[PDB]
Amino acid sequence: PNPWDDKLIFKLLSGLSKPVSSYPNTFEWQCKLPAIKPKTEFQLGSKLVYVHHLLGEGAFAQVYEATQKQKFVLKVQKPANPWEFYIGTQLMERLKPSMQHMFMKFYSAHLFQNGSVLVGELYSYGTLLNAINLYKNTPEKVMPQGLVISFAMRMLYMIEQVHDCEIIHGDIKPDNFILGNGFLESAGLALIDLGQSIDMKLFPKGTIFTAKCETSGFQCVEMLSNKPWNYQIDYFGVAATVYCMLFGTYMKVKNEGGECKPEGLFRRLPHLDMWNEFFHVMLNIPDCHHLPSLDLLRQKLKKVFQQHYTNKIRALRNRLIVLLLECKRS
Template identity: 35%
Template sequence: MHINFLKQLESIVEESDEDAQPKPSKIQKREFTVVDPWSDSTMSNLLTKISGGLKKLTGYHKSNKIYSGKVPLTSSHNALKNKDVELGGRKYHIKGSPGTGAFAKLYKASVDGNTEEIVALKVQKPAFPWEFYMYRQLDTRISDIQRPSYGYAHEVHVFADVSVLVCNFLPYGTLLDAINSHLVVGQHMDEVLCIYYTIEMLHMLETLHSVGIIHGDFKPDNMLVCYPSEEITDDTFRSETRSGQNQGLCLIDWGRGIDVNLFPAGTEFLADCGTSGFSCIEMQEERSWTYQVDTFGLCVVAHMMLHGEEMSIAKVPGTGGSYMYQPKLSFKRYWNVALWKQLFTTLLNPGSNGNHVGDLRSLRRSFQEYMCSNYQLVVKLNQLLAKQKASLCSS
C-alpha cells in the first residue's frame, strides 16, 4: 500500500512538472535579416535571381561578345564627341557629355541623324543591367500619371565588357545646378522655391516607398529640373497627384536602387552609401536602415536649398532622458519655421510606428496647405520659376 501511494505521488509530481514546462509560443517571431544591398555578392545574387525575367523585358538586348564598335565606348569624353555609336541598328551621334557619375559615363546624343530626338547614353564598365531592371519596375508599379517623375529607360545593350543604357534627356540641368545658380550671385534659393521642390520630393518618396522601392542615392544632382507646361495655380497644390503638366523634378540614376520586394519581409540594410554628406544617421552610427537613406537625403537637399550648404546634425536632449537629432544651423526667423521644423524633426527622428509613408503624406499636405493659404505665394512661385529657367537656359 505504501509503495502504491509512492507511485501515485510520483505520477502526480511528473504531471505537475509537465504542466510547469513553458508552452511553445503561438506568436512567431519575425525573421530579422540584415544585408548590404550594394555589395558585390548581393548584387550578383539579385542579378541571378532576376536573370530569367530580365531577358523578357522590352528593350533588353544582351550579347556574350565584347563591344566591337568603331569607337571604344570607354574612350575619353573628348574622343567620343561628334562620333557615331551604333547600337541595335540605331546610330547615336555623340553631341557631348552632361557629366560623369561615380559609376558611369554619361553622353548626350541625337538618334539616327534627327537633331530633335535627343537621348542620354549611360556607359558602364563592367556591364551592369540592374538600373534597367529598376526602370522597368517603375514602369510596372508607378501610375501612368506620376510615372514621368522618375525618368525613362528606352533600352539597354549589355555586352561582355560594357553596358549602355539609353534614357530620355531633359535639357534644364539638375536641382544642384539650380541651387548653384543662386549661390554664384551671392544668394540662396527663395523659400517659396524651396517649398515647391520640397513638395515635389515628398511626393516622390511617398509614391516610391509605398510600392517598395528605395532610390538609394537621393541627392540634388540626381534630380533633373522640369518646368510646368502650364502656369501653376493653387489647384496644383490641392491635388493629390502629380502629372507632367505640373511636374517640377525628375528623379534619375537608379543604379543604387533597392527593390524591397526581392528581400525577405523584415529585411534591413547595413551599409554606407559612400556619398559625402548623404550618409543617413543610421549609417553614421553603424545601425541598420531601410527607407531612411532616402528621407535623410531629402533633408540634406532641403537644407542645401535653404542654407546653400550641406547639413550637419546635432544630437540634443529630448524629453524623459531621450534625445533627438536636428540640423545645427537655425532657421531664419522670416521663414515658415514651424513647417521646416516639423519636416526635419519628423524625418531625422523616425518613429517606430512603421508608417513613414503616412508621415511623408502628412508633411506634403502641410506644405501644400501653406501654398494655398495665400495666392501671392503662387504668383511669386511662377515668377521665380520663369526667372530661374531663363537663367539656367542662358548659362
C-alpha cells in the first residue's frame, strides 16, 4: 500500500464504522471555504469567530490564532483534510489522559466543498525550528546541550506514546514541534501536524510500506535503499530533528561499512560518544520486527543529563524564555 495515496485514504475514511462525518464535532457545509484573513471576523457554523493573526505556514496549511475569551487555533487547508482530524481523534482516544498534553487536541472540524478548517489547541511560543533560528542570531549560535538533550528525551518519549497508539506521525521535523506557555512553567513541548500520519490499525498485522518521500534528503534510511518500513520513519525524523538542534542544518546520511551515519565531521560536538550511539541506534534498525527501545534510548541520554545539567537546566530555560518572549513581542 502507499500510505499517503489519496485514493487509499479516501477508501479508508469511507469504510470506517465511525466515519469522520459521524463525529458529534464534525460539521459539513455545502459551500466554498470562506475567505479567512488576519484581523477579520467570519462566520463558522453557528459561531462567529475573530481571526487575530497568522501564526505559521506549513507545507499545505495556514494556522491562525482566533477567539470566539480563551484563544485557539484554526488550521486551514485546500483541499479538505478530514484525515488529520481522524488521526487526531484516534490519537487522543488511544492515549492515556496523562499523555495528551504533549499533543494538540482538535476541538472540531468544519469541512467544506473545497477545503477544511480544523479548530484546535493553541501553543503560544513558536516552533522548535524558530527556537533554533533564535540561537543563530546570538553569540552562542547553537542551543545549549542541556536543552537539546532535554528536548531529545521528550521527543523519544513522545513518539513512544504515539507508537503505543499504533500511529505513525510520518513527518517529524523541527517546524512540527511547538513550544507553549507550559514551557514557562521540556514540559511545554508539543508535537503537531498529523496530516501525513498513518494509522496502522487500519492495515493488516505486520503491514509494511515501500513508498518514498518526494525529496531525496527527507527520505529515511529504508527509503534511500528501497527497503520496507513502518515505524522507522519516525525514528529517522527524531534523529533528523535532533541533528538540526545540534548543527542548525538538515541531516544528510552516508553509508560506511554497511552502517548508516550522519555526515559532518562532528567537530565541536560535546558528549560525542553519547550522540554517536544515539545516531547509530536510531539510523540502523535491523528490520520492522526489531525496533530499538525508545525507553532505553532515552535512559542513555538521561544518564548524561543527570551527570551534568540538573542544576543548570534552570538558567538554560530562562535564557530561552527571554529569547522566545523577545520573538513573541515582535
